[PDB]
């Protein structure tokens, strides 16, 4: 359906903007507040925009040298030729961080290609379905903040521990994928507590 | 048996036989369940 | 008051003195000088009837209505037409400039000029001239004055710069020896929260010409004082402007895109190949006729933390290239590092005379000095692999502790090779291999420009010596550090004396009192040095007293 | 603190669990020192504020002084400090409790001692304790 | 959650593995705590929250769910003698 | 700078009283003047209230290190 297609695409873009804003990337306020009719106005979708045209490039606030692509595929299952096109465009623009949606699934050979080409080109598959909602806004998920290495070492020295002793967070879980953190990262999680007010924990990515 | 070795160790951290930290402070407050009791927060419900 | 035909105290005096009718005149004064609304006049006798003075009513409504004037100028700040805004603001300005001399109506003029980007020149001149007005005027007036008066802008930056150099000297000579904390520990954002840079950014606002005045001040200071610290502030100012996101200055300063990479590297204290390529492009983007920015870049590269970044990147590149079996001539990324560091080290030469040509490198640095570092490193690792291999017979050969002296010739002839060798010395001190350490400790005694006896390497060596805290148990090692190297420049250079003295402060308990007293008598101030070395000597005497009780 | 509790407790329920009863301790101070609320009291409000601040310093769950340690110390005693400040505001102290200065000092000392006694002792096997205390209610449960 | 006019804040489930797949580990911890609080408070009985928090943290300590049965528990990196105490002992002593 | 609490846990109280009572039962010297007592438990409690037991507690911190505490240094509650 064309109407629900534009509604889905608008919420997709909104969730993407909220995501990379949470990742510290440079996101303008208007795209964070972009509405459905505004999403129509900037561009009906089916047999009219494109998943290649909808793709966006965002800069990192901390480091303007770093940029992140968000791609969308025009095909149901992303094929190796599309991965080749995306990574070659990344090579032409000298970028390594790229996010790629999938309409309903990914070819397993493309999964192998993703994990094989990871260090030279960091790619993350992402379901359209899971991307339809910003899961971070749920009531059950507490507030997550990615820690940096100085914070990690100062915490570890403050408690005289090792990375082994901390509680873990599986890297495949959707919140880590939302933040895009890798193995070795550690996330500070602030949550409300009905016996102390606030509670801070630290989860090591694995 | 699953929760056998979980213990409040000095510096008041909840840790297991593996020495992995489970809670930085027991019950998120480092307070035993004995002395605590019911009180009311007087500033929650009243109007501005 | 009399500028607008308003009766002041002098009118009251000339109506009071030489007047045989005080009652009539005072009654007419109180009636005529009331508030011009009819409804109050019915109530003013009743207001006063209780013995309540009308004073309190006057003061309360004075505060209220003046606050409402402030609120309404704040409202018209971004209301409707700019023409209507500035017309009404200039009207109120010229009206209350009569009352700017008053202590209670001056804030009205302050707020009005705070809402004006530019003002008539006479008002600015009176604000500047009258010291009470200038001390009581907001910086919005001062930005325009400095846009037409560079002298007071220099006068304002000068004490802030004095305090900055004072804190820089204290931090470079902060007596606390530890690997964790030193002068180079603070993050760039931590160093950019200084009040000096924030005040300078407020004093510049978003005007290019004030930024150019700050630039020329920094040029004068760095050149005449021969002090790199001002250059750091320049970069900080730019990044503070980048933190403010002023496109008027971000889009005109071509070194802004350079300092993207400089910030991203100096926070890491390492130049990765990506930012190296970016810096290469920025250098290649410099066209003819606009090469002055190269001098600025060299000035921006004269920041000592950037020297630390480049030197450590060179040292770590040379450390990792041994595993890959790649010579320094076979390292284009390393060659780019050498290029950038050479362009950085000649900065004061480029400000002293407007040199916009690249400094040249040394062939023997590529082919003799850095391969001699590699020679030492890989002899050390071959010895280590032999140690990790069993079956070593009695009286094994020591690591070769002979020093090739062309290495030292390059140390004492090339400031480039000198400083990278100093950072290599600090890095091996982190590796804490005594054999190579005492191998190369000779020859560091004579070095180029006294860079081995300067603040940077001395402070870093004192910081790294905490790892060698227990290595002072050998008097041979202590004599090698003190009698060998440190005390060569202690009498003749003040900073070397201070650094050796603070080293004795930290390492007094971990040496015998005989050696401690020997180094104390060797670190007596020469009778003409600063107060710091004498205070350190007094602390040395106190610590020597305290050790006998333990 | 009121806004903070609105964030923490959107359910708008005041019943919470805390190491010490402040109302009954105020009552005990009143009856020990025979305080008559039908009289104008003598308690200085700024003394109440200063004593509350000093007691807040005295109650420590997370030891050490650094940004992380002080942040954790704030978070641990956040709710109890909010409850204490709400209960022992100078308004209600001078309006309804009417407590005396010596009685107020005794109250601060008693709250300090009882809070310090309420700390979870190290060496406690809270694991098995939680396991048994959660297994016991299972013995009496209707099967729906 | 993807359907229109469905509040994606308060919407929730009583299943646990669903929350692990879609929401995340800490959300599973909170939902587990709420479910245990509901089933304990159903009959009016009250239990101190700290015990529930301890159990929920122990179950969610690994970044993934760990059932208290032998399948979940025996995977835990404990000593083999814990596995002697649990059940299915010799099956673990052979691997030891 | 012993970072642990200055209080005596109930488990520490139990162990120190039991050990000192056994010591007194083994004809140890009594570091407090008794008052006609015969049970070692009461004598150990009297010494604990007097803060006159020569035992030193060694609390093992979870990182392998430890703190040492005199009984009189800890807060007996």
Curated annotation (Swiss-Prot), chain C:
One of its GO terms (molecular function) is RNA binding. The modification N6-acetyllysine is found at residue 515. Keywords: Acetylation, Nucleus, Phosphoprotein, Repressor, RNA-binding, Transcription, Transcription regulation. Essential component of the NELF complex, a complex that negatively regulates the elongation of transcription by RNA polymerase II. The NELF complex, which acts via an association with the DSIF complex and causes transcriptional pausing, is counteracted by the P-TEFb kinase complex. May be able to induce chromatin unfolding. Essential for early embryogenesis; plays an important role in maintaining the undifferentiated state of embryonic stem cells (ESCs) by preventing unscheduled expression of developmental genes. (Microbial infection) The NELF complex is involved in HIV-1 latency possibly involving recruitment of PCF11 to paused RNA polymerase II. In vitro, binds weakly to the HIV-1 TAR RNA which is located in the long terminal repeat (LTR) of HIV-1. This is Negative elongation factor B. InterPro entries: COBRA1. The keyword Repeat does not apply. Belongs to the NELF-B family. Widely expressed. Expressed in heart, brain, lung, placenta, liver, skeletal muscle, kidney and pancreas. It is found in: Nucleus. The NELF complex is composed of NELFA, NELFB, NELFCD (isoform NELF-C or isoform NELF-D) and NELFE; the N-terminus of NELFB binds to the NELFA:NELFCD subcomplex. Binds RNA which may help to stabilize the NELF complex on nucleic acid. Interacts with the first BRCT repeat of BRCA1. Interacts with KIAA1191. Interacts with NELFE. One of its GO terms (cellular component) is nucleus. GO terms for biological process: cell population proliferation; negative regulation of stem cell differentiation; negative regulation of transcription elongation by RNA polymerase II; stem cell differentiation.
């Amino acid at each position: 359906d064309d109407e629900e297609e534009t509604y889905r695409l608008w919420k997709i873009r909104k969730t993407i903007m909220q995501l990379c804003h949470d990742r510290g990337y440079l996101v303008t306020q208007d795209e964070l507040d972009q509405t459905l009719e505004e999403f129509k106005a900037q561009f009906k979708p089916s047999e009219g925009p494109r998943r290649t045209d909808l793709t966006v490039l965002v800069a990192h606030n901390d480091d303007p040298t770093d940029q992140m692509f968000v791609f969308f595929p025009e095909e149901p299952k992303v094929g190796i030729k599309t991965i080749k096109v995306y990574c070659q465009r990344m090579q032409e623009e000298n970028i390594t961080r790229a996010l790629i949606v999938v309409q309903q699934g990914m070819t397993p050979s493309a999964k192998q290609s993703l994990v094989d080409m990871a260090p030279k080109y960091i790619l993350e598959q992402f379901l359209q379905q899971e991307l339809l909602i910003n899961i971070t806004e749920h009531e059950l998920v507490p507030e997550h903040v990615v820690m940096t290495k100085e914070e990690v070492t100062e915490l570890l020295a403050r408690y005289k521990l090792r990375e082994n002793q901390l509680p873990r967070i599986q890297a495949g879980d959707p919140v880590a994928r939302y933040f895009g953190i890798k193995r070795g990262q550690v996330v500070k999680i602030i949550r409300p507590s009905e016996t102390a007010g606030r509670y801070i924990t630290y989860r090591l990515v694995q | 048996k699953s929760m056998e070795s979980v213990m409040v160790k000095y510096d008041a951290t909840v840790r297991n036989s593996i020495n992995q930290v489970v809670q930085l402070r027991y019950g998120e407050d480092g307070l035993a369940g004995e002395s605590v009791e019911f009180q009311n927060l007087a500033t929650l419900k009243p109007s501005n | 008051l009399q500028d607008l035909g308003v009766a002041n105290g002098e009118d009251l005096k000339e109506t009071l003195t030489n007047c045989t009718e005080p009652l009539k005149a005072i009654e007419q004064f109180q009636t005529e000088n009331g508030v011009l609304l009819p409804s109050l006049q019915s109530a003013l006798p009743f207001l006063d009837l209780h013995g309540t003075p009308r004073l309190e009513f006057h003061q309360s409504v004075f505060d209220e209505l003046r606050d409402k004037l402030l609120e309404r100028v704040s409202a018209i700040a971004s209301e409707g037409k700019a023409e209507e805004r500035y017309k009404k603001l200039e009207d109120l300005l010229e009206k209350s400039f009569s009352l700017v001399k008053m202590p209670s109506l001056q804030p009205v003029v302050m707020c009005v000029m705070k809402h004006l980007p530019k003002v008539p020149e006479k008002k600015l001149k009176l604000v500047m001239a009258d010291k009470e007005l200038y001390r009581a005027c907001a910086v919005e007036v001062k930005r325009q004055i400095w846009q037409d008066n560079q002298a007071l802008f220099g006068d304002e930056v000068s004490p802030l710069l004095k305090q900055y150099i004072l804190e820089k000297e204290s931090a470079l000579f902060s007596t606390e020896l530890s690997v964790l904390h030193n002068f180079f520990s603070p993050s760039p954002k931590t160093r950019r929260q200084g009040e000096v840079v924030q005040r300078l950014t407020r004093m510049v606002g978003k005007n290019v010409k004030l930024y150019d005045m700050v630039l020329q001040f920094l040029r004068t200071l760095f050149l005449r004082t021969r002090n790199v610290h001002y250059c750091t502030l320049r970069a900080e100012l730019l990044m503070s402007l980048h933190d403010l996101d002023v496109g008027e200055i971000c889009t005109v300063d071509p070194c802004h895109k350079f300092t993207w990479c400089l910030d991203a590297c100096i926070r890491e204290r390492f130049v990765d190949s990506k930012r190296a390529r970016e810096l290469q492009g920025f250098l290649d983007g410099v066209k003819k006729g606009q090469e002055q920015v190269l001098g600025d870049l060299s000035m921006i590269l004269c920041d000592p933390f950037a020297i630390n970044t480049l030197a450590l990147s060179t040292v770590r590149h040379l450390q990792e290239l041994v595993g890959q079996e790649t010579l320094p001539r076979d390292s284009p990324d390393l060659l780019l590092l050498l290029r950038l560091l050479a362009l950085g080290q000649g900065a004061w030469d480029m400000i002293d005379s407007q040199v916009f040509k690249e400094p040249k490198m040394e062939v023997e640095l590529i082919t003799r000095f850095l391969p001699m570092l590699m020679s030492f490193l890989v002899d050390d690792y071959t010895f280590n692999v032999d140690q990790k291999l069993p079956a070593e017979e009695k009286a094994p050969v020591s690591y070769p502790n002979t020093l090739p002296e062309s290495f030292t010739k390059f140390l004492q002839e090339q400031r480039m090779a000198c400083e990278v060798g100093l950072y290599y010395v600090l890095h091996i001190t982190k590796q804490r291999n005594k054999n190579a350490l005492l191998r190369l400790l000779p020859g560091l005694v004579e070095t180029f420009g006294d860079l081995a006896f300067g603040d940077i390497f001395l402070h870093l060596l004192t910081g790294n010596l905490a790892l060698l805290a227990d290595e002072f148990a050998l008097e041979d090692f202590c004599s090698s550090l003190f009698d060998g190297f440190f005390l060569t420049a202690s009498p003749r250079k003040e900073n070397v004396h201070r650094h050796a003295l603070r080293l004795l402060i930290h390492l007094h308990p971990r040496v015998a009192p005989s050696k401690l007293e020997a180094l104390q008598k060797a670190l007596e101030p020469t009778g003409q040095s600063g107060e710091a070395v004498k205070e350190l000597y007094s602390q040395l005497g106190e610590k020597l007293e305290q050790l006998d009780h333990r | 603190d009121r806004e903070v509790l609105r964030v923490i407790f959107p359910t708008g329920d005041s019943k919470v669990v805390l190491p010490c009863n402040l109302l009954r301790m105020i009552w005990n101070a009143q009856k020990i020192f025979h305080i008559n609320p039908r009289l104008p009291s003598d308690l200085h409000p700024i003394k109440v504020v200063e004593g509350v601040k000093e007691l807040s310093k005295k109650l420590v769950i997370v030891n050490g002084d650094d940004p992380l340690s002080r942040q954790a110390q704030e978070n641990a005693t956040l709710l109890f400090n909010i409850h204490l400040r709400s209960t022992l505001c100078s308004r209600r102290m001078a309006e309804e409790f009417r407590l005396s200065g010596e009685a107020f000092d005794w109250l601060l000392g008693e709250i300090e001692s009882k809070f310090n006694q309420a700390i979870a002792h190290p060496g406690e096997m809270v694991g098995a304790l939680a396991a048994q205390s959660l297994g016991e209610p299972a013995t009496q449960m209707t099967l729906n | 959650l993807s359907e229109k006019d469905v509040d994606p804040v308060r919407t929730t489930s009583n299943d646990i593995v669903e929350i692990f797949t879609v929401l995340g580990i800490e959300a599973v911890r909170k939902a587990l705590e709420r479910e245990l609080y509901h089933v304990i408070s159903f009959d009016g009985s009250y239990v101190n929250y700290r015990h529930l928090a301890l159990l929920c943290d122990t179950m969610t300590c690994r970044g993934h769910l760990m059932a208290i049965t032998r399948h979940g528990v025996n995977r835990q990196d404990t000593g083999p003698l814990m596995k002697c105490s649990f059940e299915e002992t010799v099956d673990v002593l052979m691997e030891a | 700078k012993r970072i642990t609490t200055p209080y005596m846990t109930k488990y520490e109280r139990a162990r120190v009283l039991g050990t000192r009572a056994l010591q007194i039962a083994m004809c140890a010297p009594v570091m407090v003047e008794l008052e006609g007592e015969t049970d070692p438990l009461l004598i150990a409690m009297k010494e604990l209230k007097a803060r006159k037991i020569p035992i030193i507690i060694r609390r093992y911190l979870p990182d392998g290190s430890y703190e040492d505490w005199g009984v009189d240094e800890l807060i007996i509650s």
